[PDB]
Symmetry: none
Subunit: 207 residues, 2 copies
């Protein structure tokens, strides 16, 4: 997958860039209790969410991520490193509050539904617009154009994930709220993965 | 008023989230006799308090909030409704006590002052630091960075509230003391509203 220009696509309304990173990592984000991710995910799933989260924060907050990477190098105790991480995690969540609202204001559509269809051969995608965008085909075209490169990358990723499997239909309900909820979930899981690594004989990491 | 990760940010020190909820409901919280909130507010402000309070419990303790919503629904006599409320209210006040302790452990500043300045046009804010953190520009910048997003939303809310008004300056005294007292004020007012409603 390719992430050149992710932030600008995201700001312009390509909120779906987010999904790509998650799926390019097979991360969990739509949890039953996205307040105890530790309660439901194996070491592998937690690490996978951690991977997707770290890629995403590098992509949306490169200066912030750079800053945290610096402090993290400076720290020496694994305790100092987890505390550094938690400190910048809250920063990331705040900045994301700003970026989400900006993106959706540019979309001029409060919610969309994205359906990915996977079968034996090539899949398809279907963007379900609300009545305000049903009544405005110009925007509808703009949204479709904006998402198309990343949406195609996403279909490829999902199809390689379901090789030789029965016909599956994924529905993503895309709104400001849901994007915020997913990012909070990956963040919780990322910290959980980190705490597990530090308490162990894997107390070393650079992720 | 919608966040990502409000709990995590609050634990990291973003106590200003609390103020946000309050103002975005125009809830009353610095009361004269905060032992008889019924005595000092009409039905409408008490309702604003109950609204803002429930927002707070859902935002910082979503699991607590769900548990209590279920229990309160299951109760059928209004007396039992008040009782479910009092129980989960004491649980919430405890959980918040712990939340405040960690928040301020990350702040490392035993009290702060926040000034919101509103004018004909756009406002500003100024965080008055205590002297040890005034002498600590790294701590200062970090607190300001973490708080800034919430501060911007709050300024927006206040600016819409003081539209077309003469230059006004709001000051918030922010400490574990003051936060605990405000949320307790909300709890008693919320119960008063509930006692009315059921």
């Amino acid at each position: 997958p390719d992430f050149t220009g992710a932030r600008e696509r995201f700001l312009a309304g390509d909120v779906t860039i987010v999904l790509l990173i998650a799926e390019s990592h097979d991360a969990p984000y739509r949890l039953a209790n996205p307040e105890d991710p530790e309660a439901d995910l194996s070491d592998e799933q937690l690490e996978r969410a951690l991977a997707a989260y770290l890629t995403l924060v590098e992509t949306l907050f490169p200066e912030l991520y750079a800053e945290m990477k610096a402090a993290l190098a400076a720290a020496k105790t694994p305790e100092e490193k987890i505390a550094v991480f938690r400190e910048y995690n809250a920063r990331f969540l705040a900045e994301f509050d700003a970026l989400i609202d900006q993106a959706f204001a540019r979309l001029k559509a409060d919610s969309l539904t994205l359906k990915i269809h996977l079968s034996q051969g090539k899949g398809s995608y279907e963007i379900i617009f609300p009545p305000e965008v049903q009544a405005d085909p110009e925007r509808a075209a703009a949204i479709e154009a904006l998402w198309k490169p990343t949406l195609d990358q996403l279909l490829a990723v999902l199809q390689e994930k379901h090789k030789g499997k029965p016909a599956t239909t994924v529905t993503y309900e895309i709104s400001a709220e849901t994007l915020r909820a997913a990012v909070a979930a990956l963040a919780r899981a990322a910290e959980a993965a980190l705490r597990r690594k530090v308490g162990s004989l894997e107390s070393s990491g650079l992720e």
